[PDB]
Amino acid sequence: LTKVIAQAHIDHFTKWFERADKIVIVSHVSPDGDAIGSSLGLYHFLDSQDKIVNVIVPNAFPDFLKWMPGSKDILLYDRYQEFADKLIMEADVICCLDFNALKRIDEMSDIVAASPGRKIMIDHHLYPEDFCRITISHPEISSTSELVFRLICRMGYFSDISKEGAECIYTGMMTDTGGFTYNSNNREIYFIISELLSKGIDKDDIYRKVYNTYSESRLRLMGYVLSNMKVYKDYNSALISLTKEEQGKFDYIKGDSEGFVNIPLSIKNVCFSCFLREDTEMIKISLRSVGKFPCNRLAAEFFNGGGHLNASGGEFYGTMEEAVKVFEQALEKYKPLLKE
Template structure:
């Protein structure tokens, strides 16, 4: 049996907030991933069971490989419908902030979120939450925000009333945030949750194919190009990094999601501890998006914090540099040198 995720006081506050609210918004961070979209859709399904009419608002485009999930067609994109989204935010009674711990992680949507008078509930598994909310449910030990949403619905004795429209996005978010259950997923509770989700008739194999076997030919050729031509292996530091410029992204007709999982691949090299991806933002000049992955106890989140204006989890983190790609490479080399003693 699962241990309760909410204290009695937290449960009471959450239930009161939901009961007293009519205009409910659920939102997530920019560049939404499977956990962000999955937790929003899962919690929205629970809200519908409670008789509410929730609206999911996301800051920008989410990848094609997530658009199969039920109710994605109801999602409102802030970057495409800014005025409408601002009005919805301003008129909300309650806003759920899912899978992010600071408003700045919503980028252009942050001002609207901060100015909204609605009471806010944070449900998140990232370290160091920093938002003004009526209720903060922060559990960094959980594998994903989707796991947290499941546990909340389970504790509120409502899981039996949920359908596959709840189970599918929750499973997808748990799967993607653990790389297909290959990291941060050793807790027996995770597999108990999976067993319960499967009772709702979801096809976990099809979900896997939808996410991981649903890319374009260009994506596959991009992977080959990066691994053969761009990968820099720093053997002395048991690390690797690669760059991806705007020109290269245009060459391979890059679309959002095409770089998903690419930063993990160098970790297949025996003995490697750290992998870093440096990708030029195609929409903003002099912005380099940074992804970091590590294995074992090496804290890539500390590297992200110290050198890349970011953070995250022990083995999966991200950041952003406001500079050109050449300068980003030099910063990466300095980062590797700085952490040499723990990488060697």
């Protein structure tokens, strides 16, 4: 209902949109629900308007997103580089969805940077770069999928958002707010959800497809990791870990530890959570916080990593007990910050 996106930006893109024959949509490395949801949401709309549209991402997306209509036609850059490169170089318009810095598309950077096609960014992350000619940057909005819905609506094409398109948009809104459990207080979110439901989507089924679709081994693994968790009561923090012996034992598949780092936050007075995993070769670190404790600051100092305020990661080249000791240093240094 409220006009968040600048009308001038909407006017400009509409010009590009009407002139364009060939359009490419790009999103970030290791794309997730909102990367794929926003991209596929835009794809379905654009494809309904007699346009050649291809979605290209650097990297495979999780299997729990395969159900999404159009997902099979998403082009993986690390498997069809030459083909993708041609599409990118020849695109009249390149839509950059759910990232704001060329490093977020890891190896696609150069071809995207070089292409003479007209670039527009549609994103909700903080601190955007100026590689796009049109920049729609709204970090106050909780997902890129919502911005895509908003853009299409403001252009006057709400009626051309299909059931399939709506499914993809809802999926991204859902995943980026943890099923509307964080950063979701805004009223207009729920009007948008209602609008998407009017397109025939089944939001409950979509929840199940994304979150209630994984192996017996994965869930037993989650339980084992939780059984062996370490809580530091004076530091409002929790630690969980997986070794190579533990991973191999439970038959670890890629993406099995996804979300594990969040579970310890469901303990009362635990606002900061760390997960340590040995790689296939040393210690991978995942950090999560609830509230305002800066995950990205600790990661940058103690694990040469980074990311966002509430979710970060990085590697530590050493051993488990050695990596655990480093984690215990950071807890000690930022102890006063945690107590606030």
